[PDB]
Amino acid sequence: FACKTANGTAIPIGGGSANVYVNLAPVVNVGQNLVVDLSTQIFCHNDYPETITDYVTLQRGSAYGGVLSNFSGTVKYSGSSYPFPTTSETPRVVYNSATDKPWPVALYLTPVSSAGGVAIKAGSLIAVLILRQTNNYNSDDFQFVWNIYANNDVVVPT
């Protein structure tokens, strides 16, 4: 089991870390949602699918920088919504193919009432998401750590 970003940066068998760089809606008013769809940015596959099935959770997700200070939100994982920053590990998604396929994670963030101006600075760290992978074959328990960075400013108008 291994993963990569949309630009080909890989995390190999056994886990590791990588940076993910995301475009963000540039203007989000209070009351609107900023969507950070990682399913178009992070892909994974199973390396021995005829014998092994891989099980993948979002173990935990943390907010940083302007997301931590200026937004509240949820994380949607494979169709179900949870608090973000996270308060539990999600259920499993099954990876049963050698085809790289999306990791089905998206953040839904909305500004706090006091937010205004540049609420997320371009280039800044906005989140760290831990993908946790186990299987039905051995005791493997690996983390793929995704450090999520903004490619552009997000403004909450005043």
Ligand SMILES: COC(=O)c1cccc(-c2ccc(O[C@H]3O[C@H](CO)[C@@H](O)[C@H](O)[C@@H]3O)c(Cl)c2)c1
């Ligand atoms: C087509 O494959 C073959 O012919 C073949 C032949 C011999 C051995 C293997 C093989 C490959 C990968 C394996 O472990 C990695 O991949 C697992 C499946 O994603 C993960 O659960 C596990 O954690 C680890 O990332 C293991 Cl244990 C065995 C494959």
